[PDB]
Amino acid sequence: GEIKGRKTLATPAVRRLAMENNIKLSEVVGSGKDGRILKEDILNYLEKQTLE
C-alpha cells in the first residue's frame, strides 16, 4: 500500500498544522480537488487511528 505522490489542496495553515501532530497532508482523508482537505478532515484524521 505504498503511495507515490506529494500533493495537497488546502490553506498554508492546514499543512503546517498536520506537522504539529507528525502527520503528512496527502495521507489525510480528502479529495485534494479544490480545498477538500479542510479542518473537518484534519481534526477527524488526527483523531482517527489508522493503525492495526
Side-chain angles (χ1 to χ4, degrees):
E2 66 190 275
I3 49 176
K4 48 270 198 276
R6 284 90 208 161
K7 209 70 211 70
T8 299
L9 226 308
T11 30
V14 178
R15 192 209 182 161
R16 56 97 91 75
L17 200 65
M19 204 275 265
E20 313 194 345
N21 35 95
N22 281 228
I23 299 169
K24 315 187 91 278
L25 276 300
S26 194
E27 199 195 330
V28 189
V29 55
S31 204
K33 272 294 203 90
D34 60 287
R36 194 92 151 69
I37 312 180
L38 284 149
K39 191 159 276 153
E40 66 201 86
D41 271 313
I42 301 295
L43 218 148
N44 171 271
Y45 189 82
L46 274 55
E47 278 202 321
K48 181 80 184 282
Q49 305 185 293
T50 174
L51 208 301
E52 45 66 49

